[PDB]
Amino acid sequence: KFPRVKNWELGSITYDTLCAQSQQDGPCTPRRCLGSLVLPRPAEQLLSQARDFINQYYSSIKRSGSQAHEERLQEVEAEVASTGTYHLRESELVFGAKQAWRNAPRCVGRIQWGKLQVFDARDCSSAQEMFTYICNHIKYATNRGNLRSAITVFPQRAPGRGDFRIWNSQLVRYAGYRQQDGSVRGDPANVEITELCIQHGWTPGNGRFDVLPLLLQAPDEAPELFVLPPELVLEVPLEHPTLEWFAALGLRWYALPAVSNMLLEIGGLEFSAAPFSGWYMSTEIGTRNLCDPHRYNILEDVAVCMDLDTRTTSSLWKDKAAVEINLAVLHSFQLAKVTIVDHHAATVSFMKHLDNEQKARGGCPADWAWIVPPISGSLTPVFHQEMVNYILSPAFRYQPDPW
Amino acid sequence: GPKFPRVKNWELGSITYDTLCAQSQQDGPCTPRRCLGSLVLPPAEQLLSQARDFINQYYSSIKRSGSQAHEERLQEVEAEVASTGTYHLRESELVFGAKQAWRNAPRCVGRIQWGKLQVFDARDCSSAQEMFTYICNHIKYATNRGNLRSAITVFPQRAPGRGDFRIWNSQLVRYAGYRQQDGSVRGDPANVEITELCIQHGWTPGNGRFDVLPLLLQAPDEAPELFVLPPELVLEVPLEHPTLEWFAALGLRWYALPAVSNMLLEIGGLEFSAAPFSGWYMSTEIGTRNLCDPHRYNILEDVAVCMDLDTRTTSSLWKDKAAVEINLAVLHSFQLAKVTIVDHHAATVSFMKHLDNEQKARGGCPADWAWIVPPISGSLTPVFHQEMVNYILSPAFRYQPDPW
Ligand code: HEM
Ligand code: HEM
Ligand SMILES: CNCCN(C)c1cccc(CCc2cc(C)cc(N)n2)c1
Ligand SMILES: CNCCN(C)c1cccc(CCc2cc(C)cc(N)n2)c1
Ligand SMILES: CNCCN(C)c1cccc(CCc2cc(C)cc(N)n2)c1
Ligand SMILES: C[C@H](O)[C@H](O)[C@H]1CNc2nc(N)[nH]c(=O)c2N1
Ligand SMILES: C[C@H](O)[C@H](O)[C@H]1CNc2nc(N)[nH]c(=O)c2N1
Ligand SMILES: [Zn+2]
């Protein structure tokens, strides 16, 4: 059986046949669906994943079954047979990284998947050198506000040794300072990493938007501390198009969303340090980062400034304040000439991506709970679109924290 | 550690384990290879086991498992089955089963109320005219002049050989949907087919945006008959806004009573093909889905124009702004009219309380995240941050094929 997928707004129906190429089990079983869960609970194997990936690569360049194709499988086989592992050509790696983004079910930004600048950093042997590559990435990706998607790929994992790792979950994070009286100053999501930085010698600040340093780790060594040159970290001060007092709140966010703690798996090789960046969708900053109860939690403050009735839920003060905060983010980013996409625009393009992918591959892995935005869900077309979630390789995956 | 699904709340950081799912006797649409959780719609020896299971559920609920009465009722049920092929529920078993079906419904956010359900037994009903009297009674009792009371009316069970009782309409209250020559729809496009069915069966149609449909009621092996609800039994709330004076001029309205009439109620293998149930609305159902879905009333652009918003670009957030005010109008207008309603914040907070109750009482709660999280302001509600486990328990409300 192939899943019958329906759009309830338009009445149209597709069949996902791509899921048959899934070689990895998810968390669901016939007895119960575990879809809303955020986190998960041999030479022949490697060789098999290598052959299958090499076959995808040569299929992608219309040279499948050719001579260069067969010699490449020969190479891979020979290298694994002798050393237990192998290595990718740079052009293969580039193909692999784009394909991993393309396959990421939780990503609403995949219309962009073919446009990705890939920096090969596999020739890196120290934390200092990682830092050099990281600064290059940030400088390129940021491009004075004209953001460009990029990934930098550090050396693959090896059986013999510890991993290359970036300890920070993103290249840019605001410190979270735990007070003696339980509360948090700054970003509460970053309390643990803030404390790790301090322990490793960083002189902390006392602000709510203190850009953290990076903890970079070369294999089997203590991580090293590197401060990002403040001119490389582009930030956008937040104001509101019609609410003059909003700017007073001193709110701000950084331009570059660059995830640095996921593992990139291509053809069985694993890249434990491979930071990637694109550009923000406004709800990430406006709704989640600023309004989550366990993040900056600014909803009530903004509601009070707007003079809303905050004593009852039925006045929708939360809904009203959230919309103004999101609007302030879009306004501010557009004012600063920094790329951002609103959730209506983002989801319309994802619908186009679904149709592209339906034609190119016969389906598209999508995580509904993650694709539908955190405000105004049914106001976007993805809400009305059934989706099929499953795991394809190449893939980005979670990995354990290196401490 | 524990060999059951681990469930995390990401706002609070707390963990539970769902052991209730072990009790699931029916498989959903998911497999290890792919998740189909976002899809809306993916006997003799059999009957006995389902029956035995339900009777065990019943005797546990009254804390008498293993007792003399428990084993006698088991013998009583398998006796009746062996000699007829089916069996009858005691009254109190029906009341238990109906409640348990609601308690078990994964897509329902209102389940904190589950123990408070008035069950009207109508298993004696023997005509379509009689079904109508029962339905009127339900509506009268449940509406209660605006102070809504949850209720279900249970009509006769499927009987081997004999045809089903069916209410053709999807709800007891439904606005007509009149397809136009230009291909558009006047009224509710959700109800185009049932509207045409009513006409085909001799209803004289109106031409408004809010014409209350007649009921098509079908007794065993008979053609359905048409029944017009007396307008004084159908409570409606005109929609106005607390500060935007022009909103009332839009002439929008909604009915007080959400009463679902097309689901099958399954208890212990017995099937009640007509068993309409009603509660009260969550405001987002009306304010967001029914009024702003593009394939429903689709008034978002109308309202945004009245609010003088820039509808030419997505990034003005005109949709979001307009949706918020429409939802506000629904709440304000129901409150003014003294008609029970619950906003999505109060509703989701109470659902979180329900999850905690069920965690202690049953070791879990089957829940469908995509349906539990509201259609506006998702992450502003606590359920967005709550992982959920979805599975099918019985007694249950189930979808059944349309009778035509
Ligand atoms: C170009 C603009 C992009 C936009 C607007 C975008 C948007 C998003 C959003 C909103 C999420 C949900 C994140 C959250 O709520 O925490 C997400 C997830 C994700 N993104 Fe994209 N993204 C973009 C580019 C990229 C790129 C360039 C990559 C990698 C090459 C990527 C890989 C991923 C992955 C793997 C996830 C899922 C993470 C997980 O499973 O936890 N994205 N994206
Ligand atoms: C008392 C207040 C109640 C509230 C606020 C409430 C709320 C809701 C909401 C918002 C939905 C989502 C439906 C949709 O989006 O179309 C729903 C679904 C559902 N409700 Fe409740 N409900 C209530 C009472 C009841 C009662 C009394 C019953 C039965 C005795 C019931 C059974 C169900 C079932 C079976 C579903 C899911 C049906 C499906 O799968 O489509 N509800 N409810
Ligand atoms: C732990 N779960 C989520 C945190 N991680 C690892 C994660 C992964 C992917 C995306 C995000 C949100 C940040 C982000 C990244 C990119 C590339 C684009 C974008 N708009 N946002 C965060
Ligand atoms: C509300 N009506 C059902 C009450 N119950 C459970 C009930 C009523 C009368 C008799 C019985 C005994 C079971 C039984 C056996 C046989 C041969 C026929 C029958 N109708 N019921 C059970
Ligand atoms: C696709 N699923 C729709 C099935 N139907 C008709 C259905 C079932 C249950 C609930 C609803 C929404 C209407 C409703 C009913 C009740 C009892 C309470 C409430 N707040 N809303 C609709
Ligand atoms: C429990 C639930 O799955 C969790 O809160 C998810 C819901 N959907 C999400 N969607 C996005 N884009 N990002 C998130 O962090 C989450 N969180
Ligand atoms: C495709 C998707 O599952 C579908 O649009 C669902 C999403 N969640 C929902 N949630 C509720 N409460 N009601 C609905 O009708 C839907 N529709
Ligand atoms: Zn699933």
From Swiss-Prot, chain A:
Record: residues binding Zn(2+): C28, C33
Name of this protein: Nitric oxide synthase 3
Binding site for L-arginine: Q170, W279, Y280, E284, N289
Family of this protein: Belongs to the NOS family.
Gene Ontology molecular function terms on file: calmodulin binding; flavin adenine dinucleotide binding; FMN binding; heme binding; metal ion binding; NADP binding; nitric-oxide synthase activity
An example Gene Ontology CC term for this record: caveola
Annotated segments matching region Interaction with NOSIP: 32-403
UniProt keyword Flavoprotein present: yes
GO biological process per UniProt: arginine catabolic process; blood coagulation; cellular response to laminar fluid shear stress; mitochondrion organization; negative regulation of blood pressure; negative regulation of extrinsic apoptotic signaling pathway via death domain receptors; negative regulation of leukocyte cell-cell adhesion; nitric oxide biosynthetic process
Compartmental location: Cell membrane; Membrane, Caveola; Cytoplasm, Cytoskeleton; Golgi apparatus
UniProt KW keywords: Blood coagulation, Calcium, Calmodulin-binding, Cell membrane, Cytoplasm, Cytoskeleton, FAD, Flavoprotein, FMN, Golgi apparatus, Heme, Hemostasis, Iron, Lipoprotein, Membrane, Metal-binding, Myristate, NADP, Oxidoreductase, Palmitate, Phosphoprotein, Zinc
Residues represented out of the complete protein: 69 to 482 of 1205
Binding sites annotated in the UniProt record for (6R)-L-erythro-5,6,7,8-tetrahydrobiopterin: S36, A369, W370, F383
Assembly and binders: Homodimer. Interacts with NOSIP and NOSTRIN. Interacts with HSP90AB1. Forms a complex with ASL, ASS1 and SLC7A1; the complex regulates cell-autonomous L-arginine synthesis and citrulline recycling while channeling extracellular L-arginine to nitric oxide synthesis pathway.
Signal peptide limits: none
Keyword Flavoprotein set for record: yes
Source organism: Bos taurus
Principal subcellular localization: membrane
Task performed by this protein: Produces nitric oxide (NO) which is implicated in vascular smooth muscle relaxation through a cGMP-mediated signal transduction pathway. NO mediates vascular endothelial growth factor (VEGF)-induced angiogenesis in coronary vessels and promotes blood clotting through the activation of platelets.
Binding site for heme b: C107, Y398
